[PDB]
Ligand binder design. Sequence first.
Ligand SMILES: *[C@@H]1O[C@H](CO)[C@@H](O[C@@H]2O[C@H](CO)[C@@H](O[C@@H]3O[C@H](CO[C@H]4O[C@H](CO[C@H]5O[C@H](CO)[C@@H](O)[C@H](O)[C@@H]5O)[C@@H](O)[C@H](O[C@H]5O[C@H](CO)[C@@H](O)[C@H](O)[C@@H]5O)[C@@H]4O)[C@@H](O)[C@H](O[C@H]4O[C@H](CO)[C@@H](O)[C@H](O)[C@@H]4O[C@H]4O[C@H](CO)[C@@H](O)[C@H](O)[C@@H]4O[C@H]4O[C@H](CO)[C@@H](O)[C@H](O)[C@@H]4O)[C@@H]3O)[C@H](O)[C@H]2NC(C)=O)[C@H](O)[C@H]1NC(C)=O
Ligand SMILES: *[C@@H]1O[C@H](CO)[C@@H](O[C@@H]2O[C@H](CO)[C@@H](O[C@@H]3O[C@H](CO[C@H]4O[C@H](CO[C@H]5O[C@H](CO)[C@@H](O)[C@H](O)[C@@H]5O)[C@@H](O)[C@H](O[C@H]5O[C@H](CO)[C@@H](O)[C@H](O)[C@@H]5O)[C@@H]4O)[C@@H](O)[C@H](O[C@H]4O[C@H](CO)[C@@H](O)[C@H](O)[C@@H]4O[C@H]4O[C@H](CO)[C@@H](O)[C@H](O)[C@@H]4O[C@H]4O[C@H](CO)[C@@H](O)[C@H](O)[C@@H]4O)[C@@H]3O)[C@H](O)[C@H]2NC(C)=O)[C@H](O)[C@H]1NC(C)=O
Ligand SMILES: *[C@@H]1O[C@H](CO)[C@@H](O[C@@H]2O[C@H](CO)[C@@H](O[C@@H]3O[C@H](CO[C@H]4O[C@H](CO[C@H]5O[C@H](CO)[C@@H](O)[C@H](O)[C@@H]5O)[C@@H](O)[C@H](O[C@H]5O[C@H](CO)[C@@H](O)[C@H](O)[C@@H]5O)[C@@H]4O)[C@@H](O)[C@H](O[C@H]4O[C@H](CO)[C@@H](O)[C@H](O)[C@@H]4O[C@H]4O[C@H](CO)[C@@H](O)[C@H](O)[C@@H]4O[C@H]4O[C@H](CO)[C@@H](O)[C@H](O)[C@@H]4O)[C@@H]3O)[C@H](O)[C@H]2NC(C)=O)[C@H](O)[C@H]1NC(C)=O
Ligand SMILES: *[C@@H]1O[C@H](CO)[C@@H](O[C@@H]2O[C@H](CO)[C@@H](O[C@@H]3O[C@H](CO[C@H]4O[C@H](CO[C@H]5O[C@H](CO)[C@@H](O)[C@H](O)[C@@H]5O)[C@@H](O)[C@H](O[C@H]5O[C@H](CO)[C@@H](O)[C@H](O)[C@@H]5O)[C@@H]4O)[C@@H](O)[C@H](O[C@H]4O[C@H](CO)[C@@H](O)[C@H](O)[C@@H]4O[C@H]4O[C@H](CO)[C@@H](O)[C@H](O)[C@@H]4O[C@H]4O[C@H](CO)[C@@H](O)[C@H](O)[C@@H]4O)[C@@H]3O)[C@H](O)[C@H]2NC(C)=O)[C@H](O)[C@H]1NC(C)=O
Ligand SMILES: CC(=O)N[C@H]1[C@H]([C@H](O)[C@H](O)CO)OC(C(=O)O)=C[C@@H]1NC(=N)N
Ligand SMILES: CC(=O)N[C@H]1[C@H]([C@H](O)[C@H](O)CO)OC(C(=O)O)=C[C@@H]1NC(=N)N
Ligand SMILES: CC(=O)N[C@H]1[C@H]([C@H](O)[C@H](O)CO)OC(C(=O)O)=C[C@@H]1NC(=N)N
Ligand SMILES: [Ca+2]
Ligand SMILES: [Ca+2]
Ligand SMILES: [Ca+2]
Ligand SMILES: [Ca+2]
Lengths: 388, 388, 388, 388
Amino acid sequence: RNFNNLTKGLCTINSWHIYGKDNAVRIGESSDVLVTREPYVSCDPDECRFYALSQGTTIRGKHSNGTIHDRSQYRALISWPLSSPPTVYNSRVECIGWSSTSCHDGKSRMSICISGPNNNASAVVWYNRRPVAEINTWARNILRTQESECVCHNGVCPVVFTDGSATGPADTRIYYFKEGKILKWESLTGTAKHIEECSCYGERTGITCTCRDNWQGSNRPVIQIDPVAMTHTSQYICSPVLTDNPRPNDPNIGKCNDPYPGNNNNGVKGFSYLDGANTWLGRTISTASRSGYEMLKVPNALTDDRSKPIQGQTIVLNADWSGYSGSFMDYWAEGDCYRACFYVELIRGRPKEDKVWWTSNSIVSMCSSTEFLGQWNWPDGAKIEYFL
Amino acid sequence: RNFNNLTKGLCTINSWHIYGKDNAVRIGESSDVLVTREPYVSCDPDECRFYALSQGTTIRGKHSNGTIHDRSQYRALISWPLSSPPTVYNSRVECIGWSSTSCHDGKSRMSICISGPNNNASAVVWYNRRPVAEINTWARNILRTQESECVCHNGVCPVVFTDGSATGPADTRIYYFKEGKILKWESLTGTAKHIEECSCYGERTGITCTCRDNWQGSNRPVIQIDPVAMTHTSQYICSPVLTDNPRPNDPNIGKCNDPYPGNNNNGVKGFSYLDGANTWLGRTISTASRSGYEMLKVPNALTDDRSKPIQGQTIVLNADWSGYSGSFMDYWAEGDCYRACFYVELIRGRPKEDKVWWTSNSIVSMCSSTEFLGQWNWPDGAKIEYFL
Amino acid sequence: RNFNNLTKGLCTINSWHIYGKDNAVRIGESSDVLVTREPYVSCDPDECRFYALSQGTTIRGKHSNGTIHDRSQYRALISWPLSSPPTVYNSRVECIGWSSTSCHDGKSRMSICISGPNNNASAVVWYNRRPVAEINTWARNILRTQESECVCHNGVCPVVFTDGSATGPADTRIYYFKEGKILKWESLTGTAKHIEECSCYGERTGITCTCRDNWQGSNRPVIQIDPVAMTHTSQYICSPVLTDNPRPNDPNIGKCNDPYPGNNNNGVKGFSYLDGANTWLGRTISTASRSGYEMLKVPNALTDDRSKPIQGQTIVLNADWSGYSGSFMDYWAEGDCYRACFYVELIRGRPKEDKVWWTSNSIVSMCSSTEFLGQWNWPDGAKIEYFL
Amino acid sequence: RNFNNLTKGLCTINSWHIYGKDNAVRIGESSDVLVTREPYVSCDPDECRFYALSQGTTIRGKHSNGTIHDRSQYRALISWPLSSPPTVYNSRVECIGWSSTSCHDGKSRMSICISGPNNNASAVVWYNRRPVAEINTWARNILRTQESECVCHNGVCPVVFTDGSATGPADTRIYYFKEGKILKWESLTGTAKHIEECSCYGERTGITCTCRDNWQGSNRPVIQIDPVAMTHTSQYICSPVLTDNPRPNDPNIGKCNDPYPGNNNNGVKGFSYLDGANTWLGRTISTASRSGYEMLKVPNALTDDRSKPIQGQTIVLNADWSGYSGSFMDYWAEGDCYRACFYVELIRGRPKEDKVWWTSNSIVSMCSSTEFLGQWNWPDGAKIEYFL
Ligand SMILES: *[C@@H]1O[C@H](CO)[C@@H](O[C@@H]2O[C@H](CO)[C@@H](O[C@@H]3O[C@H](CO[C@H]4O[C@H](CO[C@H]5O[C@H](CO)[C@@H](O)[C@H](O)[C@@H]5O)[C@@H](O)[C@H](O[C@H]5O[C@H](CO)[C@@H](O)[C@H](O)[C@@H]5O)[C@@H]4O)[C@@H](O)[C@H](O[C@H]4O[C@H](CO)[C@@H](O)[C@H](O)[C@@H]4O[C@H]4O[C@H](CO)[C@@H](O)[C@H](O)[C@@H]4O[C@H]4O[C@H](CO)[C@@H](O)[C@H](O)[C@@H]4O)[C@@H]3O)[C@H](O)[C@H]2NC(C)=O)[C@H](O)[C@H]1NC(C)=O
Ligand SMILES: *[C@@H]1O[C@H](CO)[C@@H](O[C@@H]2O[C@H](CO)[C@@H](O[C@@H]3O[C@H](CO[C@H]4O[C@H](CO[C@H]5O[C@H](CO)[C@@H](O)[C@H](O)[C@@H]5O)[C@@H](O)[C@H](O[C@H]5O[C@H](CO)[C@@H](O)[C@H](O)[C@@H]5O)[C@@H]4O)[C@@H](O)[C@H](O[C@H]4O[C@H](CO)[C@@H](O)[C@H](O)[C@@H]4O[C@H]4O[C@H](CO)[C@@H](O)[C@H](O)[C@@H]4O[C@H]4O[C@H](CO)[C@@H](O)[C@H](O)[C@@H]4O)[C@@H]3O)[C@H](O)[C@H]2NC(C)=O)[C@H](O)[C@H]1NC(C)=O
Ligand SMILES: *[C@@H]1O[C@H](CO)[C@@H](O[C@@H]2O[C@H](CO)[C@@H](O[C@@H]3O[C@H](CO[C@H]4O[C@H](CO[C@H]5O[C@H](CO)[C@@H](O)[C@H](O)[C@@H]5O)[C@@H](O)[C@H](O[C@H]5O[C@H](CO)[C@@H](O)[C@H](O)[C@@H]5O)[C@@H]4O)[C@@H](O)[C@H](O[C@H]4O[C@H](CO)[C@@H](O)[C@H](O)[C@@H]4O[C@H]4O[C@H](CO)[C@@H](O)[C@H](O)[C@@H]4O[C@H]4O[C@H](CO)[C@@H](O)[C@H](O)[C@@H]4O)[C@@H]3O)[C@H](O)[C@H]2NC(C)=O)[C@H](O)[C@H]1NC(C)=O
Ligand SMILES: *[C@@H]1O[C@H](CO)[C@@H](O[C@@H]2O[C@H](CO)[C@@H](O[C@@H]3O[C@H](CO[C@H]4O[C@H](CO[C@H]5O[C@H](CO)[C@@H](O)[C@H](O)[C@@H]5O)[C@@H](O)[C@H](O[C@H]5O[C@H](CO)[C@@H](O)[C@H](O)[C@@H]5O)[C@@H]4O)[C@@H](O)[C@H](O[C@H]4O[C@H](CO)[C@@H](O)[C@H](O)[C@@H]4O[C@H]4O[C@H](CO)[C@@H](O)[C@H](O)[C@@H]4O[C@H]4O[C@H](CO)[C@@H](O)[C@H](O)[C@@H]4O)[C@@H]3O)[C@H](O)[C@H]2NC(C)=O)[C@H](O)[C@H]1NC(C)=O
Ligand SMILES: CC(=O)N[C@H]1[C@H]([C@H](O)[C@H](O)CO)OC(C(=O)O)=C[C@@H]1NC(=N)N
Ligand SMILES: CC(=O)N[C@H]1[C@H]([C@H](O)[C@H](O)CO)OC(C(=O)O)=C[C@@H]1NC(=N)N
Ligand SMILES: CC(=O)N[C@H]1[C@H]([C@H](O)[C@H](O)CO)OC(C(=O)O)=C[C@@H]1NC(=N)N
Ligand SMILES: [Ca+2]
Ligand SMILES: [Ca+2]
Ligand SMILES: [Ca+2]
Ligand SMILES: [Ca+2]
């Protein structure tokens, strides 16, 4: 087969339909379902799969005790069939670590896992299920990457890494891989002041990443990557429709080249589709906690610092827990355009539900529709008392 | 490969032999078997599989509590290997929803799931395991479809949908799909007064659907579809051998173009094979509850309003619970004719067995034989007290 | 690919080496392992698999209570990977019933299951995982067949069936199938007075079946089938080395054309390889119960009514339970000769161990070696008290 | 496809990165994970897999009681997907026995299992998942082999066997197989005085085995095999950096042709990569017990009896249990050189943790990097109290 080429634009987004949901925590109440977090979705040319970071234990297993912990030697990036739960028996390990990305280039899949102690972490780059390249920490402060799929164009797969402080200036690098080999890496340029956990998608013939400013910003940093020239720019979403969490209330003027202030030293992984008038932003409903999720149609959110919603859709009720969210597309589907998709992580357990001693999640996933479809709300569905 | 063409007639039906049985509830007493309901069977050119709507939990799982509920965000259409139980680990999710159909066209499989709230439901059409088309509710009252396989001819797959009241006139549409794309849709024509949960099979070169009249009828509505012209007619089974449930006792004159009265606002999904003198009707043995199942040979049941049984076979004893039933065939088997098959849903738990708080089912499945084979009876086999 | 042709003779048998063992009961103490009985082994051209009749429940499942029962609607012929246990999740159902056979012809597999009540049982013949032919009971008294693999030559697969009394004259038929279709069937001819559960193997270019006389005989009936002419003969193993169970002590003169007396109305499925001086007989060590198993080299056992052992090998200690045993070969292995193989069923639970209320089994399997290898003993290995 | 040829040298080893870890004991606390020991890793041309000797029971299963036992009829060589746990459902049995090796030759896999009583054990050689050759015990004292992968060159796969005393002179043989057939076998030559459990790797165009001296030596025996000529030599690692366990403290002069004294009648399976200045030795950190693991860069360890470490990396903390370790490489990866890999067995339970009555293990696995990557430590991660 061939390297996939980003030759298509996004489909028109008039609503979102249900694409995938695994009900992991519901099922894992009485099945050998693996504790996970930081999930995402990524497609091969013949199959789409769920991904997450395992915690090396099942939910009912006693080792689930204390899995709010982010980084341990018992974590690993796993994938499993679409809308199935991540079980001990059906899960395929891609690589070992506690921060990851993964993407198919049309021929084979590249997966990257970061492992190690905070001051000595390292990334291993896997291609065609074999280890190919390794990158050592350059700032010795929790080397970390996207926690969602990367995008490939003609065999070139850009990945965004960050090494350094989570509450101040850090050292962010965009790496360009082909077949697992390092072609080139760049220091972060542009006006974005802090970069974490970029959510990327590809469209003719560029790659757009919506990331997390954990330092001072409640608006989201945007990195736009050219995968042919292997260059990039950065700024923020200009829109006053702020999409981080926690975050202040929406002003009437956003910020294009600086963080919008109000909430320091925190954030959540999130995403957006920036496509002129076809722009949709995702965010939690709450401005304080990781609860609820909605999609908002905000024309020219990227460049218009006055832009407001003209349409929207509720994905998760504010009364229900959410969490991380990120973008993905099936680049091998039929049609003239790429259908925009995303997932929402539904975190259950700690810190918000400390009656149990574990932290896991399930996945809900949506794709766009050119129809104006009715909306439902998609909660995790598990009842905590059952786990007591 | 090629699109399957309905070039064959039905085989002669002189009896029914055992084809499949999963013993799900028996096995699920001490295994991670998924709670399901509304099951069916559908074949690929190289494999036949069980299908059902999952409830997003195992039987022993505490979340099975309250699964008599029909529609929730935790349901999904799953398939699994023939005569295996639907387990957490061996089940493949086809799409997310609480009403479905699915069928192979010879090249790839089309699956359709409906999800959403009662006044805003929507169908997503999957083809080759990718979402292709979406249909929004047109009557805003539980958009719903067949709950058994559809039939394809030369790439054209007709599906029967209903939107609107379950106790009065509703808005029924026949959709014609090819490769997941909507070719055409039609409003329901003919003399059938209410349409739900059609059970279809294909024979040279038309498609016959036996459905459920939930309004006033205890005789079954029949839709006959021409998949080339993409047109249809409707009426009832003329036979006084009434095959819904609940239902009145068999009269000596049936009704061809109107519901036979006696039982309002209720029914069960059922099926028939209408083939002149090769006609076999299926039904529950009880006229009051979903218990028992039998096949009755009723010559010209479709057109003869005096027709009576001349042969029969017991499938499930009246002392045993049954439920939904529907038709399917292996259109890729060897031979000159299509062998008629069906399944019976064996519902266990609520409402009829309320010592437990769940509702699930297992599957028994039969196909026709040109031999006159001895009959057995096929109960679910699970003992409720074990679940207490 | 092509139909397999029996073009080779048996390899020289100088000992037996371990080939397969699943430890099902050991593992099933704390895993979802299916209760089974009547197991065997059968090879495809690219894989060899374990087979058995499931009881439709796991060992720990409460439904295992009463599985000493031979025939129920919850039984089915399952296969699973070599030396794995028969679990809920890894088992593939071949067909539904409580008596079976199965064999590959080089192109596809034919499986046959008998189901039904005692006076109305019927066999369904599956080929390439599709139902092809059906045979109704001709004597209305537990229609039953081999409970081990059949053998195919040039697409022709002979099967031995018996219908009628287990304690008197019965109606035995040899059926000849090709691609699941009935080519011909014959009434049992020769001097064998009672036929049950034949164990067959194929060698240039005939098929040899060693069966069970449940009526009066403690010597074993032998059917020799010509798969080209589609004809057969029958007699007993002439050897005074009696190989049924229960059985009298070995005399000095056996019987060639009549049952050797002493034990009526009982027996066990067993096997032999009859190959001139390369002859090996299998049997239980005990003459009273299904315990122990040994192979005995008895030159010309088939024709010499004075023949005695000149070599042997213990397979299972007399202190350990055994059960059914049968023959199989990999007809697609490399080499000039067919390597003789067999399995022993290790029955655990009732009737011999009635502290538990279930009956299951595990499998040990051996093949011949041209070396003179050391012997071990192969017990089931499960400790009953753990199940209490 | 073709026979793999050892045409490449080792890559430069500047550090080790994480390659695989299964967390079996953590996961097996609440999942059907098989009790194992003596694990290793071996690659096919399209997949790499974990291997181990099963104990025929799960960890939570009551039959895990007493699995410190080395040799029983319930053991078997199993393989399962990389970094998954060895579960009942995902494990593939390769052959039956309590001592093993296995390796792909580029076309198919050869697996060897030894079973039997101590004075009558025998090896069965499997090729392409079929039994091909058998070797009887020649010294009648626990016939035993490598417990890690073998290496093939042009279809020739050398295996090191030992039969005889574990505390004195034994009879060691190097067997040369092709497609499972015995080409030739040799008695052990050279200056190595005792040989057990060789860990081998292949490099242009020879095979290097690092073994265990269980008699008098705490330095490791090295066998170097020529797979074309089918000949070999033996000696010890000259280095004073002693790498057995238990072992004395490191002297300043090692031994090239005799055992370094201090610890009798004990040892552990271990490995090394001997490549001039690219030499790395593995060993436990403790000199007394199987705890901890480290890699040490020791230039010319094989020939220089004064050589000392100039670089190193901790793999497992001394406070954590280790166990067996062995070498493997992906001989089908891309590149100009072979990347050196190894695994460490992390033994949990008895004898060191006798609060539980079982003995199992999990696996950590590493490969080399030409980068100088930061190090972590990789413990098993299971907490014993959970199992009480
Ligand atoms: C079956 O399903 C269908 C399909 O899903 C359902 O229909 C959907 O219903 C939902 C819910 O109502 C809609 O989502 C909302 O959309 C509105 C935007 O639509 C309105 O505004 C448009 C823009 O108007 C402006 O510009 C135009 C320029 O021409 C001008 O005309 C106008 O006067 C004004 O100047 C209108 O164009 C639009 O009209 C169109 O749509 C109508 C249908 O809605 C139709 O009838 C019309 O004919 C026309 O076609 C419409 O009036 C979003 O604004 C809204 O999002 C806000 O509200 C939710 C709360 O519900 C909140 O969570 C959001 O975050 C957002 O509110 C925050 O952000 C604002 C901007 O920063 C801020 O000002 C707010 O104060 C608020 O801020 C606070 O909350 C946030 C959140 O925590 C916090 O962060 C802040 O700090 C602060 O605390 C919804 O997304 C769908 O659009 C609609 N879809 C369709 C296809 O109709 C249907 O209801 C279902 N049926 C049933 C029976 O249930
Ligand atoms: C081993 O296995 C074999 C194979 O399975 C077993 O053999 C099978 O046995 C079963 C059970 O007996 C049979 O099923 C029944 O079949 C009859 C129909 O067959 C009879 O009627 C035929 C038609 O006769 C009429 O027309 C001809 C025209 O020529 C005329 O000759 C005749 O005088 C009359 O005018 C006859 O042709 C037929 O004869 C043939 O078959 C004989 C074998 O049966 C053979 O001996 C003959 O030589 C000849 O070849 C035969 O006489 C069905 O009527 C019946 O179904 C009714 O009964 C069951 C109860 O058992 C009920 O559940 C059904 O729903 C149905 O009864 C309801 O419907 C009627 C119509 O509406 C109504 O009038 C009834 O009052 C009743 O209604 C009530 O109940 C329902 C249900 O709840 C409710 O909804 C209503 O409101 C109301 O309450 C059976 O299906 C198989 O046909 C037969 N198969 C074979 C191959 O033989 C064998 O027994 C097994 N062996 C052993 C040892 O067990
Ligand atoms: C490592 O592994 C190796 C390989 O496995 C082990 O070596 C094996 O050891 C076993 C056990 O000893 C052997 O099995 C037995 O074989 C004998 C037959 O071998 C003997 O007899 C041969 C025939 O002799 C006759 O004919 C020749 C003609 O030339 C003539 O020379 C001779 O005088 C006599 O006329 C001899 O050829 C043979 O010698 C050869 O082998 C020797 C090694 O064994 C070797 O040293 C010699 O040099 C020569 O090469 C040898 O003497 C079987 O008879 C025996 O089976 C009987 O006994 C067991 C009990 O152990 C019983 O269960 C069997 O069913 C059978 O006994 C019943 O059947 C008889 C016939 O009907 C009857 O007469 C008996 O009374 C008895 O009947 C009773 O019990 C049954 C069972 O319940 C019941 O049904 C009845 O009603 C009644 O109650 C064994 O199978 C292997 O052959 C041998 N293999 C090899 C390769 O050596 C080695 O031991 C292991 N090492 C260690 C350290 O453990
Ligand atoms: C992030 O990750 C990185 C990468 O992993 C981390 O960096 C790593 O850190 C580890 C731990 O410190 C290092 O491993 C140790 O390496 C030393 C060897 O390196 C030293 O020695 C070299 C040789 O020196 C000699 O020769 C040269 C010839 O030119 C000469 O110059 C010199 O004077 C001397 O003559 C030096 O070349 C080397 O310098 C280089 O490296 C420096 C960085 O380390 C760098 O700064 C320099 O500029 C230069 O480039 C360096 O000085 C090993 O010796 C050591 O292994 C011993 O110690 C451990 C305990 O920690 C022990 O377990 C080992 O078994 C071994 O000690 C035993 O064996 C000896 C030999 O038999 C014996 O003499 C000892 O007494 C001891 O024996 C006792 O214990 C054993 C064990 O139980 C027992 O069996 C005995 O019986 C007895 O009881 C370590 O392996 C890595 O090399 C290093 N890697 C890199 C790339 O830097 C970094 O730290 C991490 N960052 C953070 C913040 O954590
Ligand atoms: C490498 C790492 O630990 N990344 C963190 C992430 C991180 O702490 C923040 O972005 C601060 O830099 O926060 C969160 C979070 O829940 O907000 C999950 C991630 N956990 C994992 N990726 N395992
Ligand atoms: C969409 C929906 O909920 N369909 C119902 C169905 C429906 O209520 C009746 O046909 C009335 O219209 O009844 C029943 C039933 O048990 O009779 C199961 C179905 N459940 C599911 N398909 N999930
Ligand atoms: C065949 C056999 O039993 N090999 C032993 C091995 C052996 O005892 C020593 O090398 C002494 O010769 O020791 C050990 C050990 O834990 O040190 C595991 C092995 N267990 C297994 N391979 N099953
Ligand atoms: Ca922030
Ligand atoms: Ca009705
Ligand atoms: Ca008998
Ligand atoms: Ca030693």
